[PDB]
Design a protein around this ligand. Structure first.
Ligand SMILES: *[C@@H]1O[C@H](CO)[C@@H](O)[C@H](O)[C@H]1NC(C)=O
Ligand SMILES: *[C@@H]1O[C@H](CO)[C@@H](O)[C@H](O)[C@H]1NC(C)=O
Ligand SMILES: [Ca+2]
Ligand SMILES: [Ca+2]
Ligand SMILES: [Ca+2]
Ligand SMILES: [Ca+2]
Ligand SMILES: [Ca+2]
Ligand SMILES: [Ca+2]
Lengths: 186, 397, 260, 265, 264, 132
């Protein structure tokens, strides 16, 4: 493991080395979703919802082919995704595509990423989905500048504030969400 | 030269002590010395340069003294002192650069860079403030002859020699006995190799001796003596004595038995160490004699007996190594080191201003060929240029 | 050379002595009569010389010396050339004979004579051996004790001796080193010489035309080595062997070195 | 995805070792044994191939990945071999009288050759380096060569009288000919039955593995007599039956596939 | 020295910090193969360890430059410093040590491994060029030992592997004309910057400033800030030596020196 | 310094950047799913590919503010300096390249070069305040 424990998660089986370790560790966090180890919108929920929407608005969907489509969807929806962990006003993000951003809660401002802490946190502490990932989060905090409560709830990926923005027609969230759909194409 | 060091030291202490808000009680002496320096310089016209790309500068000094009326120093004083100090600083720097580039066999100690011959006069004696540094102290001691000394950390007294010596050779280079050595800077890595592992030699022993003869005596040297020289312990393809052919060298490292180090001074033994590795000391020595033995292991295992047969093929060659580093030392003469920059300052000035090769220093001032023949003229010129280089460095780093 | 040679490591490697040593040296092949037989040509020597003239060897530098059999070659071999190559047919029946031939030519021996009817000889080190040459050697030995009497043999009755050799043209005998032996040999037909083995002869190159490497040069059964100048080939014709030798002569001559 | 270009690569040393690509390369590869008919004869069975496949299935190799391709004799195999799999194993019987033949077969399959054709009747050919050899395959090759001089006259041979040539191969199924490099040769070949090709030896083939089932290791891959090397994919066994040999191959297949690596080309 | 340079910077002037064995090279231990194969049996490349004040580089060819023109294979190592240096005393020797014994290394992607059994030869046509802004400043041809470099932000070590034209049997039996190549010819170079001078601040083997800083931070459990990396690791702090980091580093080094003047 | 400051997604026209040392442009080429005959004739599934699909981007820095000195399209300081040097045939110095080619002078913009360049630009402005 990277350090300070090897429970099972911190297994680097295999650009920078931090990126590689974070990708290898984040491709396991896909299983945290189906463990009740989440707090927010729980990305597989969106995947399942899109699946339901499509299999209900489609015509060619047969009872013989819905099997292995409920599997191909679950397996090939959002292949490149990102997760985050919060610990005492320090937020550590990570993604399977090899990106990693460390920042603060109130005033979004990047910070050096601390492996051997992000790992010991993502092991036990609840992990959250990156639907509102740091890039769009900072674009939003700059252009559409946001309150402390809304920022905390975007960190936690809360449906209330998410749908509030989506009804206020915030394009910095609408574009990310449409990206998620077009990544849930199949 | 002493006055040059005084100039440098008081300009340094003026850039340091004379600042805004300080207290005249702390800088009264420095200020009287500055004003005396001024009083003595004013009225003189100096010239610097005239060799290589050194621009021919003319210095004219007419300043005004530093008042003694204030109690605390203000910016209207600091600023005048800074504008008076920068000029003297670049003056001293250009003088040191014009002095690091001149040589002679005839009276190398004598000041060159005739501006310095002028500052050596008796009217400029009023500028002396304190000759405290090690180099200037040793300079004054050499002038008033006395037991001098410089303290060096990892001194560069060994010229680069990476060479072998074969006491048993054949055109095929298949049953050899000899000693290889790399003497560089402050380290000696020696390795005696026998291809036979002393199977035919008397009592299954083979003698090796390495003698080093330093060109300048040392004192109170702290040394680290380890076995198993690293850089003569891996496969090698070495050349022949004349550069005709090449031979292979597949070492297998054994330990020196009956190891014996002798530090001597003009053939008289001084220090002798028997089977003591690690940190050792040498109080005074001009010569080193390392002597070790390759001893065939009488009781052997199969895996090793299969390496040292009783016939010529010998695909594994027994070796015995020794590393010897001089961590610190004390020397009556001036050398190069790992901590101090004076040699680099000198060589950089010369490489910059394109100084032709003089009658004394080798081309490019290569320390190997400079310490290989450390003639007293070379030693004098080297002490002079290193002293003015230290001086220059006390102002412009 | 037991003198204190000295050198350095910054010296540059000089140009290749090859294409000058070829002109100032000579080469000598030693082939079996079976080769000339299978070839059935008369100008094949001039052919090989005109071929070597491409690789650089001049005309009057290459030589060929026929030999009918391994034993008729092992009977007093006379190898006097600045480079020697010896092509050697493999035969399990001739294993010890061709290994003795190898241990005799590849290595340099200092050979003193031996008078058997007047003296009793012994070995001192593991490099002292007794090499016997001639038409047919029949060697018998009796080791003796402290008091000049035989161990399992009688100093008079030659029938009690131990027969180490039986009609061999070349033999190399190693016995227990530290005991006095009395010998009986066919001195009319075979002469025997007490030889000490020195460093290797770097002038000859053996080429086992056929089977696997079986040559055990060293008498001690622990080394079992295979040096650089001991080659192996697999063969069905001889022209291909000679062409291979020609094309790769420079490697052979890099593996041998200039006896003079 | 650049092709045909050789680019500098870069890496590090603080990078960790990845997982065992075995138990996946087996599933995503193919294996081909080449046994002699004497094996099947001694065995006297017809389900042994499926038996070995069911055994391999316990080592990781699936059913439709292993193949057994028979060859009646070393020379028949040598006649135009075509080894097209992702891992090839060859079980070679030892025969003193076939030593050079089964050395040439090894030198042909273990190594990778870049071959151009040859038109004897038109041109006079030469070798440039120690790798440009002449390999001739067919039913019965009878090769003869005349080296020529500066003025395209013969050297101890007559360009007209074919009988004056120097026969280097007599009725062989596979010949690998190395001649003096730097002279122009003229050849006589039974082209009706044998095809000859000027082939330059490239780096080795890491896809095939020879296994001498019997006697000592004799294979001299390198035509030059000085080296006489032995590589990792040149193995040896001692045999009295064939079931034991195939069991051994099966049990130590992973060692074989470790000794082998897929082809660069 | 530190406060003098501080004052000089505030009143802009040519500063200088003198260093003994400065830690200007971040730890980098890596290879580069200009001829690669899946089996890794005939390779050509260069390996380097750049750490602290030392550079140990080694160019290896497995074929001993047999198929290369003139029986020669070139090797070049370019190093780019993150801060200029002057008046540097350098110790340059051949036959790098840590890359001169058997080794098992991984590939680039880390999947498989390869072997490396070296045989050390000497660099021929060696050329060490200390450059500054791409223009060459100092050049050294076949000079080994103690050398000087007066101003340089770049180093170019260009050496060659020359096949020995004349070879004894024992060495000719190692470099054959065929691919097996159980002995791989190498050409190495060690280069240690013993002394140096830098306009900016660095770490050394002589001073305790960085140690004091890092110890204070580790003791009082300071969180990570927007400038310094976690634990203030010199590798990640020299690899990105941006002006803000340089300023904060100068500041904390100055006050650490101040604190060391009283409590060491 | 690898830290992100500004990001812009699917915006065109005029944009802003408050502080930056690095630019990262990322775009895509997306095959048209629905394709008319003419375009389908240019984009087949076969290798000939007589019409190569491109995706472009222009980006011009119309204004900026820099802690260091540079050249512009408005100020003639670089021109005064280079013209003086070319007129009076100044040898090549240890710092600036030959002819003061701005490409080779910006590609390596070391602090010594920056200092000397600020100096010569300042005196060039001082001179152009009198004789343009
Ligand atoms: C060695 O060969 C080179 C290149 O052919 C040549 O320039 C040089 O003069 C030769 N030297 C000797 C001593 O033959
Ligand atoms: C890593 O290799 C071991 C040993 O073969 C295996 O048990 C393990 O499953 C591998 N890891 C993964 C993630 O498959
Ligand atoms: Ca015999
Ligand atoms: Ca004996
Ligand atoms: Ca008896
Ligand atoms: Ca054949
Ligand atoms: Ca050939
Ligand atoms: Ca003929």
């Amino acid at each position: 493991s990277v350090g300070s424990s090897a429970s099972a998660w911190t297994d680097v089986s295999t650009v920078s080395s931090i990126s590689t370790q974070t990708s290898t560790i984040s491709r396991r966090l896909r299983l945290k979703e189906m463990a009740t180890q989440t707090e927010g919108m729980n990305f597989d929920d969106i995947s399942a919802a899109v699946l339901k929407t499509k299999i209900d608005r489609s015509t060619q969907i047969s009872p013989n082919t819905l099997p292995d489509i409920v599997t191909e969807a679950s397996e090939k929806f959002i292949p490149n995704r990102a997760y985050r962990v919060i610990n005492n006003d320090e937020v550590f993000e990570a993604g399977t595509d090899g990106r990693f951003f460390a920042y603060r809660v109130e005033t979004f401002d990047e910070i050096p990423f601390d492996v051997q802490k992000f790992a010991d946190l993502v092991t036990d502490s609840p992990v959250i989905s990156a639907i509102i990932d740091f890039k769009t989060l900072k674009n939003l905090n700059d252009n559409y500048g946001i309150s402390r409560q809304q920022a905390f709830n975007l960190l936690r990926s809360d449906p209330r504030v998410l749908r509030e923005f989506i009804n206020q027609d915030n394009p910095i969230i609408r574009n990310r969400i449409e990206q998620l759909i077009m990544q849930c194409r199949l | 030269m002493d006055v040059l060091y005084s100039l440098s030291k008081t300009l340094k202490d003026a850039r340091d002590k004379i600042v805004e808000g300080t207290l005249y009680s702390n800088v009264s002496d420095l200020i009287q010395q500055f004003n005396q320096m001024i009083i003595t310089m004013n009225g003189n016209e100096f010239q610097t340069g005239g060799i290589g790309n050194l621009p021919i500068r003319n210095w004219n000094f007419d300043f005004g003294l530093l008042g003694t009326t204030l109690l605390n120093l203000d910016a209207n004083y600091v600023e005048t002192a800074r504008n008076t100090i920068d000029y003297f600083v670049d003056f001293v720097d250009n003088v040191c650069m014009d002095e690091m580039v001149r040589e002679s066999q005839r009276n190398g100690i004598a000041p060159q860079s005739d501006s310095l011959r002028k500052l050596s006069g008796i009217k400029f004696k009023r500028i002396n403030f304190d000759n405290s540094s090690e180099y200037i102290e040793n300079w004054n001691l050499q002038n008033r002859r006395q037991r001098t000394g410089f303290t060096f950390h990892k001194p560069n007294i060994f010229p680069y020699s990476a060479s072998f010596t074969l006491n048993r050779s054949q055109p095929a280079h298949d049953n050899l006995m000899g000693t290889m050595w790399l003497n560089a800077g402050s380290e000696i890595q020696v390795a005696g190799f026998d291809y036979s592992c002393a199977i035919n030699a008397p009592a299954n022993i083979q003698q090796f001796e390495h003698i080093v003869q330093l060109r300048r005596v040392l004192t109170t040297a702290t040394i680290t003596l380890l076995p198993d020289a690293e850089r003569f312990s891996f496969p090698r393809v070495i050349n022949s004595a004349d550069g005709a052919t090449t031979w292979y060298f597949n070492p297998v490292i054994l330990r020196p038995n009956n190891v014996e180090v002798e530090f001597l001074l003009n053939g008289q033994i001084i220090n002798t160490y028997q089977a003591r590795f690690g940190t050792i000391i040498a109080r005074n020595f001009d010569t080193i004699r390392l002597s070790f033995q390759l001893m065939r292991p009488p009781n052997m295992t199969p895996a090793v007996a299969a390496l040292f047969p009783n016939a010529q093929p010998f695909e594994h060659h027994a070796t015995v190594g020794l590393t010897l580093r001089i961590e610190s030392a004390v020397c009556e003469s001036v050398l190069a080191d790992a901590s101090k920059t004076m040699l680099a300052n000198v060589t950089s000035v010369r490489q910059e201003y394109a100084i032709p090769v003089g009658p004394v220093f080798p081309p490019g001032m290569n320390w190997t060929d400079l310490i290989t023949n450390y003639s007293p003229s070379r030693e004098d010129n080297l002490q002079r240029v290193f002293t003015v280089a230290s001086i220059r460095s006390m102002l412009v780093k | 050379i037991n003198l204190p040679i000295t050198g350095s490591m910054d010296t540059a490697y000089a140009n290749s002595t090859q294409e000058e040593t070829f002109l100032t040296s000579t080469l000598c092949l030693y082939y079996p009569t079976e080769a000339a037989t299978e070839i059935n040509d008369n100008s094949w020597k001039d052919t090989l010389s005109q071929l070597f003239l491409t690789k650089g060897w001049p005309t009057g530098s290459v030589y060929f010396k026929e030999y009918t059999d391994i034993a008729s070659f092992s009977v007093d071999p006379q190898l006097y050339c600045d480079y020697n190559v010896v092509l050697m047919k493999y035969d399990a029946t001739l294993q010890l004979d061709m290994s003795e031939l190898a241990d005799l030519i590849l290595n340099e021996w200092l050979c003193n004579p031996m008078d058997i009817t007047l003296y009793y000889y012994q070995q001192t080190d593991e490099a002292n051996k007794w090499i016997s040459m001639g038409s047919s050697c029949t060697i018998k030995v009796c080791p003796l004790n402290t008091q000049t009497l035989g161990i399992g043999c009688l100093t008079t009755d030659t029938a009690t001796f131990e027969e180490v050799a039986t009609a061999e043209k070349l033999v190399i005998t190693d016995v227990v080193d530290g005991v006095n032996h009395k010998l009986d040999v066919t001195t009319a037909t075979c002469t025997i010489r007490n030889c000490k083995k020195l460093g290797p002869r770097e002038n000859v190159a053996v080429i086992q035309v056929g089977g696997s490497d079986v040559l055990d040069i060293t008498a001690d059964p622990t080394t079992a080595p295979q040096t650089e100048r001991m080659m192996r080939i697999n063969w069905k014709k001889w022209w291909q062997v000679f062409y291979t030798v020609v094309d790769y002569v420079n490697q052979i001559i890099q593996a041998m070195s200039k006896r003079s």
